[PDB]
Amino acid sequence: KTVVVTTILESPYVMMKKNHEMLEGNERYEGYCVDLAAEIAKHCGFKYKLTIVGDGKYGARDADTKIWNGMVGELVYGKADIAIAPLTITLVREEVIDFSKPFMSLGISIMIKKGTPIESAEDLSKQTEIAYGTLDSGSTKEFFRRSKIAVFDKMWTYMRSAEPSVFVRTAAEGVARVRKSKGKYAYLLESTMNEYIEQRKPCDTMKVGGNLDSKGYGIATPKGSSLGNAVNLAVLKLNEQGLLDKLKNKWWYDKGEC
Amino acid sequence: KTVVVTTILESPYVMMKKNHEMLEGNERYEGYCVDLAAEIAKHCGFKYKLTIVGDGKYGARDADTKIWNGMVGELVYGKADIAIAPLTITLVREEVIDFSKPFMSLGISIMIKKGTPIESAEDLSKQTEIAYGTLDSGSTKEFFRRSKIAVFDKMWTYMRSAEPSVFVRTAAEGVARVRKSKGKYAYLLESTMNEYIEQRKPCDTMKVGGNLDSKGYGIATPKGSSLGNAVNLAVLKLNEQGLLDKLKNKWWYDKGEC
Ligand SMILES: N[C@@H](Cn1oc(=O)[nH]c1=O)C(=O)O
Ligand SMILES: N[C@@H](Cn1oc(=O)[nH]c1=O)C(=O)O
C-alpha cells in the first residue's frame, strides 16, 4: 500500500541534499525524478517511499545466469512497485516490465575533456590514443554490444577487449575519468547527463557529435501492475501542462554555472 | 484478418507516387509511414491494407457532439485496425486508443516565409501584421486551446477570433499559405514537417524558434486490441536496430533539394 519507488543516484535526477545526514525519508533527496515522483504521487493519489537501488545499477540480464540486476531486477523480483529514474525504454526491458510513455527524450552522446581532438564516434573508432568507454549494466553498453553499424561494431570490439577496463560502475566515475585523464579518456553517455555536466563547475567538459540514437526514459512498473495505467496518464498530463518542461529547466538550465 | 491500416496524406510520411493513377492497392503510396507499415507487418506477420482516412483528419472530439473524427475516430468506431501515421500521442487520445512507444520525437514549431521578422512565439504574440495559425482537428490546435502559458494563451485568444480564419484543413494548405502570403502568414506545425519542407523546392521557408513542446508519434490501435503488444515490440526493435534512423534519413535528408 505505501508505494516502493526504486531510483538511482544520478545527478540531476536524484541527488543527496546538502544536510542529508540530518534528514529522514524522502527528504534526504532532491532532483528532477524526486520532484516527478511527487507530481506522479499527487496525480495518482498514492503515498510512497524513495529507495536507492541496492546494487547501484540500471538493469541488465546476465547472459550467463539469466538474472535481471538493477532497478529492472527490483521490479522483476517484486522488490519495488515503481521505478522513477532516468531509465531507458528498451525492447529487452519492455519484454519484462511495463513503461510509461517517455517523460524525456535523449540519445547516446560523447563527453570529452575540453580540447580533445574528437568530433564524432567515427573519430573515436579511427584511433587508439584516446580510450573510450561506457557504464556497466545500462542501455549504452548494450547499444554497442548489439550494434551491426560498422563504426559502432568497431568501437564495441575495441571496448570489450581494452586494458585497463574502459567501463565504469557509475556515470560519476565516467565523468571524473574524462576530467582526470587529460583528454585520454572520452565517455559514452546519454545526452541529458552530458548536457547537465557541461553546465557544471569546473566547466572542463563538452558534448561533441550528434546523438548516436533516439530514445526515451519511462516510468517502469512490474509487468501487469495496476499502477501503470494511471502513471502513464500522469506523465502525458504533466508533459501537456508544461510541468516536465519547467522541471527540466529547474534541474538543467537554472542549475547552470558555465 | 487482413489488417486495415488508416493513414493520412502528409509528406513525407504518405504520398501519392508519381504513376499512382496506374497503380493498385498499397502500391499507390510511398513515404516514411508506407515503409514503416511494411516493416511492422514483416515483424508482426500480418497482411494489410493501406487506407487514407475518410475525412482527411488526425483526430478531435467534438466538444459538442462528443464524437471522435479522423484516424482516431476510425480506430474508435472500429473502421480501421491500426493507424500508421504522424499521429501525436496525447492524453485525451490515450484515454480512447492504444499507442506504441514513439517512433519519432518532435515538438510544435513556427514556419515562416524567408525574411519574416519573427524569431519566436513571443514575437508572434506581440504583433498583428503577421497572421498565424494551425491545422484543424489535430494536436497543435488543442495545444493552443488548453495552454495556460501566458504567451500561448494570448496566441490562442488571437487565433480563435482572427478573421479571415487562420486555421487550415491540411498541412499542405498551411504551407502554401505561408508561401503565398508574402511573409504575412506564419504556420504553427510540428518540427518534423517543418524540417522536411525547409529542405524542399522552392526553398522559401524556414523553421524559427525552439520547439514549443516535446512529444512523440505512436502507432495507434483500438483500446485493448491484440495487435498492440507486437507492434510496440516491433517499433522498439526497429529503433534499436537503426531502421527508423535510416528511414528518417531516406525521407528527409536524401530527399533534400536546398
Ligand atoms: N539510462 C541508462 C543508464 N545509462 O545512463 C547513461 O548515460 N548511459 C547509460 O547506460 C539505462 O537505463 O540503462
Ligand atoms: N500530428 C498531429 C497533426 N498535426 O500535424 C501538425 O504539424 N500539426 C498537427 O496538429 C496530430 O496527431 O494531431
End-to-end CA distance of chain B: 44
Ligand 1 site: residues with CB under 6 angstroms?
A 58, 86-88, 135, 138-140, 171, 189-190, 193
CB A188, CB A110: distance < 8 Å: yes
Show the CA angle centred on residue B66, arms to residues B60 and B68, nearest 5°. Answer: 35
CB A82, CB A221: distance < 8 Å: yes
Residue whose cell numbers read 577487449: A161
Measured distance CA(B215)–CA(B31) in Å, rounded: 21
Residues after which chain A is discontinuous, using a C–N cutoff of 2.5 Å: none
What contacts B213, CB < 8 A, 6 or more positions away?
A239, A240, A242, A245, B107, B108, B143
Q: Which of B228, B237, B238 is nearest to B3 (CA)?
A: B228
Q: Are residues B195 and B247 in the same domain?
A: no
What contacts B155, CB < 8 A, 6 or more positions away?
B121, B124, B125, B132, B144, B147
**What is the identity of the amino acid at A157?**
T
Q: Are residues B113 and B185 in the same domain?
A: yes
Q: Are residues A138 and A200 in the same domain?
A: yes
Q: Are residues A86 and A96 in the same domain?
A: yes
Distances (CA, A) of A229 to A76, A109, A251: 18, 32, 27
Interface contact B243, partner A, CB < 8 A:
no
Measured between beta carbons, the chain A residues lying within 8 angstroms of B101 are 89, 94, 99, 101-102, 216, 218
Helix (H, G, I), strand (E, B), or coil: what is residue A190? strand
Q: Are residues B33 and B45 in the same domain?
A: yes
Q: Are residues A197 and A234 in the same domain?
A: no
A91 and B233: CB-CB below 8 Å? yes
CATH number of the domain encompassing residue A208 = 3.40.190.10
CB A156, CB A147: distance < 8 Å: yes
CB B43, CB B230: distance < 8 Å: yes
Measured distance CA(A78)–CA(A90) in Å, rounded: 20
Measured distance CA(B188)–CA(A59) in Å, rounded: 40
Q: Are residues B13 and B94 in the same domain?
A: yes
CB distance B192 to ligand 2 below 6 Å: no
CB distance B190 to ligand 2 below 6 Å: yes
CB distance B87 to ligand 2 below 6 Å: yes
**What is the identity of the amino acid at B121?**
A
- β-strand pairing of B215-217 with B205-208: unpaired
B94 and A101: CB-CB below 8 Å? yes
Measured between beta carbons, the chain A residues lying within 8 angstroms of B210 are none
What contacts A253, CB < 8 A, 6 or more positions away?
A199
**What is the identity of the amino acid at A82?**
I
What contacts A130, CB < 8 A, 6 or more positions away?
A116, A117, A118, A124, A183, A184, A185, A186
Chain mean position to CA B21: 25
Which residues, in sequence order, are bridge partners of residue A113?
A: A205
Which residue pairs, CB below 8 angstroms and at least 24 apart, start in A124-129?
Answer: A124/A155, A124/A186, A125/A151, A125/A152, A125/A154, A125/A155, A125/A158, A129/A184
The alpha helices in chain B, defined as continuous H runs, are 32-44, 70-76, 91-94, 121-125, 139-146, 150-161, 171-180, 191-198, 228-240, 243-248
Q: Which of B32, B86, B20 is nearest to B71 (CA)?
A: B86
Q: Are residues B111 and B236 in the same domain?
A: no
Question: Closest chain B residue to A218 measured between Cα atoms?
Answer: B101
- Which residues of B carry a binding-site annotation for L-glutamate? 86, 88, 93, 139-140, 190
Task: Tell me the DSSP string of A11-66.
Answer: TTTBEE-TTGGG--GGGGEESHHHHHHHHHHHHHT--EEEEE-TTS----B-TTT-
Measured between beta carbons, the chain B residues lying within 8 angstroms of A245 are 213-214
Give the one of B91, B95, B237 whose C-beta lies nearest to A240's C-beta.
B91
B197's enclosing H/E stretch is helix B191-198
Q: Which domain range does residue A35 map to?
A: 1-106+216-255
Which residues, in sequence order, are bridge partners of residue B94?
A: none
DSSP assignment letter at A253? I
Give the one of B89, B214, B244 whose C-beta lies nearest to A105's C-beta.
B214
Q: How was this structure obtained? A: X-ray
Show the CA angle centred on residue B185, arms to residues B179 and B190, nearest 5°. Answer: 80
- β-strand pairing of B215-217 with B104-106: antiparallel
CA distance A213 to chain B (A): 8
Give the one of A149, A236, A245 whose C-beta lies nearest to B91's C-beta.
A236
CB A139, CB A131: distance < 8 Å: no
Q: Which of B133, B95, B94 is nearest to B216 (CA)?
A: B94
In degrees rounded to 5, what are phi and psi of residue A41? -55, -50
Q: How many helices (DSSP H) and strands (DSSP E) are in chain A?
A: 10, 13
Q: Are residues A211 and A125 in the same domain?
A: yes
CB distance B88 to ligand 2 below 6 Å: yes
**What is the identity of the amino acid at A240?**
E
Measured distance CA(B152)–CA(B186) in Å, rounded: 15
Measured distance CA(B89)–CA(A167) in Å, rounded: 36
CA gyration radius for chain A? 18
Measured between beta carbons, the chain B residues lying within 8 angstroms of A91 are 233, 236-237, 240
Q: Are residues B96 and B220 in the same domain?
A: yes
CB B32, CB B248: distance < 8 Å: yes
Which residues, in sequence order, are bridge partners of residue B220?
A: B83, B99
Task: Say which ligand is closest to the CA of A69.
Answer: 1
CB B145, CB B122: distance < 8 Å: no
Question: Closest chain A residue to B91 measured between Cα atoms?
Answer: A236
**What is the identity of the amino acid at B206?**
M
Domain count of the fold of chain A: 2
What contacts A18, CB < 8 A, 6 or more positions away?
none
Helix (H, G, I), strand (E, B), or coil: what is residue A92? helix
CB neighbourhood size of B195 (10 A): 17
Q: Which of B94, B228, B189, B156 is nearest to A94 (CA)?
A: B228
Residue whose cell numbers read 495518482: A44
Q: Are residues A144 and A170 in the same domain?
A: yes
CB A177, CB A109: distance < 8 Å: no
Distances (CA, A) of B192 to A19, B107, B252, B256: 45, 8, 9, 14
Pick the atom of ligand 2 nearest to B8's CA: 3
- The length of chain A in residues reads 258
Give the one of B94, B105, B143 whose C-beta lies nearest to A233's C-beta.
B94
Helix (H, G, I), strand (E, B), or coil: what is residue B130? coil
The reply to whether omega before A86 is within 30° of 0 (cis) is no
A59: left (phi over 0), alpha (psi -120 to 50) or beta: left
CB A154, CB A184: distance < 8 Å: no
Measured distance CA(B216)–CA(A102) in Å, rounded: 9
Measured distance CA(B258)–CA(B204) in Å, rounded: 10
What contacts B78, CB < 8 A, 6 or more positions away?
B222
Measured distance CA(B187)–CA(B209) in Å, rounded: 13
**What is the identity of the amino acid at B53?**
V
Q: Are residues A98 and A220 in the same domain?
A: yes
CA distance B118 to chain A (A): 23
Measured distance CA(A33)–CA(A223) in Å, rounded: 21
Can you read off the three cell numbers belonging to residue A232?
502513464
CB distance B140 to ligand 2 below 6 Å: yes
CB B191, CB B108: distance < 8 Å: yes
Show the CA angle centred on residue A80, arms to residues A78 and A85, nearest 5°. Answer: 135
DSSP assignment letter at B26? G
